Amino acid sequence: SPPDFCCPKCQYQAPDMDTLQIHVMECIE
Ligand SMILES: [Zn+2]
């Protein structure tokens, strides 16, 4: 099961899908 909870900005590992989206939404300055 290829990990899909990875951020395309810093490869950050998210515990879920929602939190992950929130991370990327601001991961960009
Ligand atoms: Zn990120």
CA dihedral 27, 3, 19, 9 (to 10 degrees): 0
On whether the CB atoms of residues 1 and 11 are closer than 8 A, the answer is: no
Binding site for Zn(2+): residue ranges? 7, 10, 23, 27
Full domain range(s) for residue 29: 1-29
What is the distance, to the nearest Å, from the Cα of residue 21 to the centroid of all Cα atoms in its chain? Answer: 6
**Distance from Cα 9 to the centre of ligand 1, integer Å:** 5
Residues contacting 16, CB < 8 A, separation 6+: 5
Report d(CA 5, CA 11) in Å as an integer. Answer: 9
The HSE-up count of residue 28 (CA atoms within 13 Å, CB side) is 6
Looking at the structure of the chain, the number of domains it has is: 1
Residues belonging to the chain: 29
Closest to 15 measured CA to CA, from 1, 28, 3, 25: 3
- In this structure, which residues have their CB less than 5 angstroms from ion ligand 1? 7, 9-10, 12, 27
- Structure solved using which method? NMR
